[PDB]
Subunit: 184 residues, 10 copies
């Protein structure tokens, strides 16, 4: 009905059963829509767990584009990383199920690589905007990949240990890389 | 009689014709083996571009085991990163083709994630051995992910621009993260 | 309930009145659609009994493409044959006891032979992909024809005797040929 | 041989011109008979490419009736298949033209299905005679259909190549299915 | 086993491909004979379009021997001319192709001259038998040449215009010369 | 030197030795010219005996074109036939050798047929000019062929019997056909 | 009464004891006949294991003579070879004992050579009948010898290895020669 | 002194008179030896026509053992078959008499069977050495039997028809089986 | 095998790129040697596709020396031809690439003629050794050249088809010339 | 004395100075012609030793085309081979004692192989025309190569020993191969 409603119901089904054992009609039925209605919002089954990531990416780009130019690069990246990954008690529970599906499902990895490249494109664009131009240059690209590593490290620590704050995990992972490998 | 021979032949075929249009028989035929003989070494077409990675990981462990304890953790990680991706003049051309297939083929990404997790496990073990113990701790884990991002950044820069040295690319990418984001 | 509904209604009138004295408009009228609406789903009267065979062929090819390469050729053929003949009592009635429009109508045999050639092309492609050179080589072609004979034998046994399971009929017919004529 | 003469003449005309552009009078004229005389041997145009066929089926029955009872069933089927499809260099040429017309002409397919059913009836009767059961049981029926598929595969291979022995093609095609799909 | 069969096959080939591009093996193969078997009946490719002309000349002699002596010389010549070129409905089409090859192919003209001389010898003998004796006398010789010219004129008119009867053409051409040039 | 000189010397050589055993250089040598000089006047060896027939045909056409319209067809043809074939004692001897070569040499017959068709074209044109139009109509064509038969009959009678006048032979042969076959 | 009953009885005795240690009277006694009655059916002890081979040869000739001419030569020979050697569980047991005594007894070899030459004559006659007709010609006779070797190879493999079907053994042995050493 | 000299002398006598009408003493006398001297080289009359076959078999084994492994099996067998049966005009004459006595004498057949089994053992060993190694296995032994039939077919054709080369006969007989009954 | 390794590597490069676009350093680099090290095994680029060849000729000499003297000359030549050209499925693949380079590359033809002369010298010596005479006599020389033509015919047939056994091709080609042109 | 004269003069200077250090102008100068006059007859330096081979090939094809079809294949090949190697003492000197530019010059071997392929194409076409399907089939191709080997063997024997007749050498070399290697 909303994209988000379809995604949420799909993630409940993927959490309970397999990803592989849940069909697109199972999702349509559980969401109370016709199958073709589902395809207006999602072109594929693999797209469904990645709910409205297009919008998340636009918002992250918006935040980074509008961050005051006097704010240092490191501070902007840490600020932006933690802003998009802060959640309420309710939305934290479904995000935990969603990330389990995304990170651990073999069939989602091809599609996920496209989503990660989108995210890295936003980060690299931001660095290119603050430095010399060209998203594909070494330094923007290294910063984007580094940031991706930080995030996935934090997400995995969070999933392994249910007592950890996601934003504390992200902050800690960021700080390793912020400080640098030359310092432990 | 080698996994390596099968892999080499398979990469030549995947480079020329694409991945999906190359059969497992095409590989067995080009390698001069029966189809079953191929399955002794590989349980899948998707496994084949990765060669004998189990042995590469054992030799990375060997290199890290034999680094002197007085050698600093950053130096050991940078030394191991660049050594693990140094190939004879013999093998530069085939490695370029191999990494194109691995990095760019959607069908390899599920399998690739397992291989990257293996590599990160070796790195994390080494860091835990030099710091407080526990492979799954946060930090000997952030370092492994960070180092993976550095590597993939270097590999992509290398593939995009043929006038880059791979070891220079890895060294440069490592040094961003080694120095830290706190220092531009 | 759009191409199917048209097909079901058509088979009713074809199974009611001579395929030759049922017109495309009679079918449109009985299905409650305009004449040109029917032509979006079917280019011809002869196409209507065959439903969406294009999709059945694509799905059979999809199943054979995606079968694990470690699975033997005989097992894959038997698996694929019996994977598309499972239907519910209702769907089975638009199929058994009653005879077949497809098998038994003289006017549809020329066209039906072209549809069977499509099916044999899927089978022969799969065999060629697992074993040898070209789709037109004798062995892929003999296997495709053998498979077609098995299928038509099973379909006729099923129509002749309404107490028999289609998938059991297919499995039994396959097993004669699997075991071989040298063991009768 | 009055029927055979008419058929031979008809097939030379069908080979040179269309099937559809050759009339029943064209056939009568080329055969040196009145139009009415042709109808004592053939009830329609579509019957003519099949020659006597009633007589070919009686001859196949005669050959199977006269095979020694001590000869095993597999050997008898292979022996009959290959003997029923043997000729001079001379009669091989007319048979190539005849089979092209039979296999490829849309208007002959309905009629051909009745001729194939006759042939399968002979084969199924023979199997029932050596094994017991009824002619309409699964195994005689599957063997008859299988043998038809073998034959059409052989015929198509033979037509597409023209360096190929028909009896070698039939023997090879039979042997795949004789050995069984459990082998190749 | 027939000269006629070889000739018929050869004429079909010469019509489709031209004379020079058809080999003696192409003829032996199409006729279903060994190459040496062809040379029993023909000592040359150039001989083949002329079939068993020796026998046609013996049968022309037979027809002229059996014409009643009371039948006038002109009537006998016209009767024999038209009978010698009358062919069954069976053979009109093949005779059209045969005469095209004979009349129009440069390579056949040397051989053809020998066959025309044979025919003229039969005619001249007959005229000498009805008049004063001596085959080589002037007049039973002029008549033979004149009759040959009449025939070839008729044949060419027949080939040029498919709506001409050959026997009407021969009869008309004969009648010019029969009536004489003294009468328009 | 002249075309006629080359032809005359060629005919002396063809008379003494074979046609087949005399080469084009033998002719060039005996005529006292270079080989390429011979090819300015003759495109082929086969053309050489037919010396300046192009000119003979133009002259025959000229004579027939200019013959008074009141002169009857028969008279014009007989007049023209005998005018072009009248010769002195010297030129009669070489014409006898030339016609022997032309009429009796197998290798000249293809080329000769083209020359005879040229001659017949002149005759038929003349008849078409006096009657209704179209050289290819039946009557002009029959008259041309008849005239050719007359001529060859006369030439052969002349060659067989050295005591005969060529113009008397032509006149006698003409008169058979002029009178008509209805009168002996 | 029957030569084959006498042969069957004789082969049971030859299987249990020696060939060499079984007398002609032992066989007469076991078969329920007088000694001279046995000699009306068999002129020698060496003849007895080859029971009514004369009849087997006539039957083989009959089968080969009556095979349809359109059936190819290799198919006819393979079909004929396997038809005479297809046996019930019961008849398989006595055939195994019979062939053991024939193939392994030195004293039977002279007589056996004459029986094999009879068999080869049937095969060569069949080939001569389908090709040019002289039974002593090269190909008729090469085919007969080859087929004899195929058969004896199959029989020996069959006796050596109790897991093997006789008709499978014959078919496999035939197929090596029918295919070719290539 | 030589076993083969004794055999050669014996075969000249067997060719001229019967096998059956030539005694062992007749052979001793013709060979210029005492009777017991003959028995040191041959334990039996039946052994004598098969002269020094033990040595022929060792030589055949030597030749087959030493054929290069890259040479295909059919070529090796055909090459070996024709090498042992290539003879000068002189040696052809005595070989013809030797094979006539061996192939046609009933009394030699028991002994001959043992010699043929020796020959087949050499062939089967060679095949086992190139393939999986057990000399009693099916294919080793089918090939040995087949090759025996080829050889005897060639020998008999050769004896029947004085216009035929032995090596041509063997090559032709080999080629039927090497090609196939197809 | 140092020479063979360099040659194998060189042929993979020559197959992928040109002959002309592959340098001696490219070969040294791919073989994992200094440029100077390559020159101890090969005196030029054109030598490299031929491998050791000196050693192949010594091996052919060894094989012919060790063929038993009682083996007839024809059998020894056929045996040597086929043994010298035998391989695994593996080494068949490299040999196909090698022979393409040897047979098709203009710059190798001069050098190839010297290699062919070496091969013919071995064959001619062997024939002289079995027959007497000198190596340079007509018959040894003709047999060596004939055998070279047989081989190149076989090699070309093998390259153009790829379903063909090299040893079958050689055996067939040998047998035409073994049997003689007096047959086929 | 125009393309020949150029060739003769060229061979003199080539047989005088290194083919490599004789230029196209030296040849034009020594022949007494302008440089561009030479290029009307020869497109290249490599063409000059080969004379007018285009014409030799056309003549060999002409001889084979026109050989009586009753003549056996072996006889036709031997006849054709020895029909073009007859020369006068003078023409033979521009051929024997002295060695060959064509056979012995390294720089002309690549080009010479293309000229030999032309010759083999003539031979193979002739064989295919007498016997089978395509020029590229094994037997026509083997016969052409065999024939080439025979020729080169004869040419070398002729050059090595100036007392030998070329046609006797060719005939002897042919006869080895005609008789066959099975009779050495």
């Amino acid at each position: 009905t909303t994209p988000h409603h379809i995604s949420d119901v799909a993630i409940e089904l993927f959490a309970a059963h397999g990803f592989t054992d849940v069909s697109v009609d199972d999702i349509a039925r559980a969401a109370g829509i016709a199958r073709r209605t589902l395809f207006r919002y999602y072109a594929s089954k693999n797209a469904i767990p990645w709910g409205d990531f297009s919008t998340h990416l636009a918002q992250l780009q918006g935040l980074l584009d509008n961050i005051d130019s006097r704010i240092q690069l490191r501070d902007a990246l840490r600020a932006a990383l933690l802003a998009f990954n802060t959640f309420d008690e309710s939305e934290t529970i479904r995000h935990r199920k969603r990330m389990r599906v995304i990170l651990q499902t073999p069939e989602l990895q091809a599609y996920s690589m496209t989503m990660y490249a989108g995210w890295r494109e936003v980060i690299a664009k931001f660095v290119a905007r603050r430095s010399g131009g060209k998203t594909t240059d070494f330094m923007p690209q290294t910063v984007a990949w580094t940031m991706l590593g930080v995030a996935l490290s934090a997400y995995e620590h969070w999933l392994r240990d249910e007592s950890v704050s996601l934003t504390e995990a992200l902050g800690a992972a960021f700080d390793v890389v912020g400080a640098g490998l030359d310092r432990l």
